[PDB]
Amino acid sequence: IAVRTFHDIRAALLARRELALLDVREEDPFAQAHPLFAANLPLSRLELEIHARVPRRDTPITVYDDGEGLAPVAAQRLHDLGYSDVALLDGGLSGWRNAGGELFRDVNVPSKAFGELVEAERHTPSLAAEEVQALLDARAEAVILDARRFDEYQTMSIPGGISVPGAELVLRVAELAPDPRTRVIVNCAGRTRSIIGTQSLLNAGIPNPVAALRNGTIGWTLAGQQLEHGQTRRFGAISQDTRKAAAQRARAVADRAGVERLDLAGLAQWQDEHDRTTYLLDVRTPEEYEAGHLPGSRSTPGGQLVQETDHVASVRGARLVLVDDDGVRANMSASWLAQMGWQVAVLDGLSEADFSERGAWSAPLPRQPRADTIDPTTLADWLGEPGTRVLDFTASANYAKRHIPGAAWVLRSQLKQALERLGTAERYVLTCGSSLLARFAVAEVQALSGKPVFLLDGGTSAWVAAGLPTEDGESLLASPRIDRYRRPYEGTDNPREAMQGYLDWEFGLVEQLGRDGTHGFFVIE
Numbered sequence: 001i002a003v004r005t006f007h008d009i010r011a012a013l014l015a016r017r018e019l020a021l022l023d024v025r026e027e028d029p030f031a032q033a034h035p036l037f038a039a040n041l042p043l044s045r046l047e048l049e050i051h052a053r054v055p056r057r058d059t060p061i062t063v064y065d066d067g068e069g070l071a072p073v074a075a076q077r078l079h080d081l082g083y084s085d086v087a088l089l090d091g092g093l094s095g096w097r098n099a100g101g102e103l104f105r106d107v108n109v110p111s112k113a114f115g116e117l118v119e120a121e122r123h124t125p126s127l128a129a130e131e132v133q134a135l136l137d138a139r140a141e142a143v144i145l146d147a148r149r150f151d152e153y154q155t156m157s158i159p160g161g162i163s164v165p166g167a168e169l170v171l172r173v174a175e176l177a178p179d180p181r182t183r184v185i186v187n188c189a190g191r192t193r194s195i196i197g198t199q200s201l202l203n204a205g206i207p208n209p210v211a212a213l214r215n216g217t218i219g220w221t222l223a224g225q226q227l228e229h230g231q232t233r234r235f236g237a238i239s240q241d242t243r244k245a246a247a248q249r250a251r252a253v254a255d256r257a258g259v260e261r262l263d264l265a266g267l268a269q270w271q272d273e274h275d276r277t278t279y280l281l282d283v284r285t286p287e288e289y290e291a292g293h294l295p296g297s298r299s300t301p302g303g304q305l306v307q308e309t310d311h312v313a314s315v316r317g318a319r320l321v322l323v324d325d326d327g328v329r330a331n332m333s334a335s336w337l338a339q340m341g342w343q344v345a346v347l348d349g350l351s352e353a354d355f356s357e358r359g360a361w362s363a364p365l366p367r368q369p370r371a372d373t374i375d376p377t378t379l380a381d382w383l384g385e386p387g388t389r390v391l392d393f394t395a396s397a398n399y400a401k402r403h404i405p406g407a408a409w410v411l412r413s414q415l416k417q418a419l420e421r422l423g424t425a426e427r428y429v430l431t432c433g434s435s436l437l438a439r440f441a442v443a444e445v446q447a448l449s450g451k452p453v454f455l456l457d458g459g460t461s462a463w464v465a466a467g468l469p470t471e472d473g474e475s476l477l478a479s480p481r482i483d484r485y486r487r488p489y490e491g492t493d494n495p496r497e498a499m500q501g502y503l504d505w506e507f508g509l510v511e512q513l514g515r516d517g518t519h520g521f522f523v524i525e
């Protein structure tokens, strides 16, 4: 395990050499401060995502934390998983700060900062919440398209809004706003996806007057206006005429942004070059993906690939190949990734036969460690007497929703502390949604406790499937709930102060990008 400094990372970013800068702390602390291109991969779930986010075993990986002692453990596990070029960031987070490195809060910062850059450079049109409300009061001919995931749209939405995820905008707009006089308004929860969506439509050159709802659902609430909930308005299937026209416009945008082209043979060649990381991504809807997709491809709906790029393409400097079956979605998404400095190509010449693999994406995993298992009914019997400690590794949010009675929620990254707090037990039984994450924790629990440790066969899902009783709420938390950053732009229970604070934070991103100076972003037109 070597050591790499802020300067080593900065040099690689400027030269655009592949690298993976991983913050191994939990998400909440990550969200308080981290380098622009640092990807968050909590030590707690390192093994579950590393092979997908950093596929090249010899990729220069640099892990860090802020002194918790998580980094050295992460480095060792990576070595044992087969990664040959692992290092610790000199001084950790503080080392980066002390060297003069720029630090950012929140999540998916490159994507959000880029969004602000687009508006700053192209002056992307926007309408105040009050102006849009007036249009509604005037029964104006206008459609409001929500560019977020369908589940976000269902949580809360702008009155009359229609769900049209980011990458679907250029493809579906002609069917939702056929009259060129019809105004098209794009919204999200905050600003990012609304800016990208509005500019996507302008870049594609639609005849309709377009504008982003300024500050989205957050702005709607701050304006004292009313949101709807549980809505189901959504885009529909389009005609071939609509598709062909939009595809021509999209391809032009992609060519303009420098998006590369590839055919199946070209793809195979890239995957044959072991000196580069190549992510094969399907930008269509989840439903289409599961109905049939290219072998080796991962499902990353376009709008979200552009919004949460670091969750998938964690190796900055890597190569991306996008898949779609319409000629619009991949081209548009690629144009944005190109502007965010990514080397990206769109896969051409695909036929219906190429989408042969079916079902949900199966993430690549390392060898599964061995463990002695116990059936749900046996565990129930054990719990009839004291002495059995059940540890739940699922996300704290999931735990609060439903868990095995008496189970203690824990952070895999803080097991020593959790076990001390819980006292002693005659035996431990580990669980999680399916038992997958808990299985990777067996060895550590055995080491720290020196007690018999078992894995619940099938996890909590199996327990529930057995008809056994469950308990909800924060029954017993043996670790602090820092596994998830409370995004001010998700849900409707965030205080107005936090929501306005989120907008203020985005307002300062372009200035921060200037101070960082390693992004290489550019905005076409």
Ligand SMILES: O=S([O-])[O-]
Pocket (backbone or CB within 6 Å): 148, 188, 189, 190, 191, 192, 193, 194, 216, 489
């Ligand atoms: O992309 S929006 O929800 O901030």
